[PDB]
Amino acid sequence: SHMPDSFGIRAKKTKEQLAELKVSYLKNQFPHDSEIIRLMKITGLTKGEIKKWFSDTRYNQRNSKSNQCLHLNN
């Protein structure tokens, strides 16, 4: 016990922290829990801010079409 804080009250994810989250989306669009803990280590974020971001990025993947996507797997 040395650092008593990792909890960003209404704190915005900086371009560096947010870009590490992008690396996790590019390797797999549905992140494994161990990879999310690794993001909390590098960035200094919470698992809540991370789970929030990937839900936004899943829609950001289909921004213009809004509802469906091209080359949809069936």
UniProtKB/Swiss-Prot annotation:
Forms homodimers. Heterodimer (via HD1 domain) with ZHX2 (via HD1 domain). Also forms a heterodimer with ZHX3 which is a prerequisite for repressor activity. Interacts with ATF7IP and NFYA. Interacts (via homeobox domains) with DNMT3B (via PWWP domain). It comes from the Eukaryota. The chain holds residues 462 to 532 of 873 of the full protein. Ubiquitously expressed. Expressed in podocytes. The gene is ZHX1. Acts as a transcriptional repressor. Increases DNMT3B-mediated repressive transcriptional activity when DNMT3B is tethered to DNA. May link molecule between DNMT3B and other co-repressor proteins. Residues 6-68 bind DNA. There is a cross-link at K27 (Glycyl lysine isopeptide (Lys-Gly) (interchain with G-Cter in SUMO2)). This is Zinc fingers and homeoboxes protein 1. It is found in: Nucleus. It comes from Homo sapiens (Human). The lineage of its organism: Eukaryota, Metazoa, Chordata, Craniata, Vertebrata. Belongs to the ZHX family.
